[PDB]
């Protein structure tokens, strides 16, 4: 059937144990080692946009070594509100967003508190009028 390449490796982490070929629709998760934090979406699945070769649907998260003193500011998206996501934001924590009635979302809907007290690994999402 339609089949994906290898998943990105993750430095200082682990990946689920699969065995090739990788069929379309296969999930794998990423985790980080004992004292590292996962930054970015943890699940990745093999999907097909062109309906001919499979490809993974988002980038690999990467592990950041846990900084105990790290904290990010309260993150705000003009035109959306924070759904899941509980303050205080220490290292590794995430937040998700939804746009308000009459707004489309353009960007990845979740961000992580990076050890450098800014939110990554993407830009904050953008909400746009109709």
């Amino acid at each position: 059937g339609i089949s994906c390449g290898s998943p990105p490796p993750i430095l200082n982490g682990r990946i689920s144990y699969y065995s090739t070929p990788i069929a379309v629709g296969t999930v794998i998760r990423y985790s980080c080692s004992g004292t590292f934090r996962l930054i970015g979406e943890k699940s990745l699945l093999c999907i097909t946009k062109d309906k001919v070769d499979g490809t993974w649907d988002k980038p690999a998260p990467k592990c950041e070594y846990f900084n105990k003193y790290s904290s990010c500011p309260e993150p705000i998206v003009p035109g959306g509100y924070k759904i899941r996501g509980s303050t205080p934001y220490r290292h590794g924590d995430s937040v998700t967003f939804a746009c308000k009635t009459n707004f489309s979302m353009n960007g990845n809907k979740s961000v992580w508190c990076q050890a450098n007290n800014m939110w990554g690994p993407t830009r904050l999402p953008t909400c746009v009028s109709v």
Binding site: S16, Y17, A23, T26, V27, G34, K42, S86
Partner: protein, 294 residues
Amino acid sequence: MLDAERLKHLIVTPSGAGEQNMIGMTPTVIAVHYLDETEQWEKFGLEKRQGALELIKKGYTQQLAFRQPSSAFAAFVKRAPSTWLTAYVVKVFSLAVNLIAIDSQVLCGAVKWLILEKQKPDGVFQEDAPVIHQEMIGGLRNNNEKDMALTAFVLISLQEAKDICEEQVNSLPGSITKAGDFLEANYMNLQRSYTVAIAGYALAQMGRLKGPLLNKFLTTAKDKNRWEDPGKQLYNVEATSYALLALLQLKDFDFVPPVVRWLNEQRYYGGGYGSTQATFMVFQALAQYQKDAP
């Protein structure tokens, strides 16, 4: 920290119907998870790991043989699909995918089934074919407050699976909402510590456990450290594990350790009759705690 040596007996060859397969699948899956998280693999023989992955995988495959055309599960194919079991399978796989690759259509089909077939207009998940092995369902075995409890069980699965299945199942965010809705309304009315706990975590994952609700939850704890009722050591362990998970989700680290303590102090290491829920929850909870240990 529950010691790896005392857990050897949780690596189990999974055999049987669509239930016993899950019964035997549960402990192995959660144990590998624990050792993975608590790093304890060198202590307990690295080479035993590949061994248990195949075991898990075996469980997984075997289970698929019980999946129906609806994408839902019952003990055998002939039987009416079970709302609880389906939810339980999703729950387990969602955790299993940390260790073995899974087929997301299996899982997402399962979820889409629970939503479009078994969720009421008001937002509750209805059970139509109770599982044969009533002992594996943990504290839901008690009649009282069953809507609320079963609704919490499913929710916790749908949240646990949310991040995989979001694009595939288009009704899923709606469902989560409609359930959490229902749980809010009736949460203040809960009687059992058990339910207060499960529903608590369900709503904790949703940022909905706050004000008088957070209060209800916290003050339900006997000794600021455990969620108990005249039922069983296992219900309580289960109930507490949820509660612990819930605390982790709120990040009230200032209230957590006496809980962990108690859980730790139970001298309980999974396994036995009725143990499925208590096993799966307690090691899930405890490992989460390790990950998050500041």
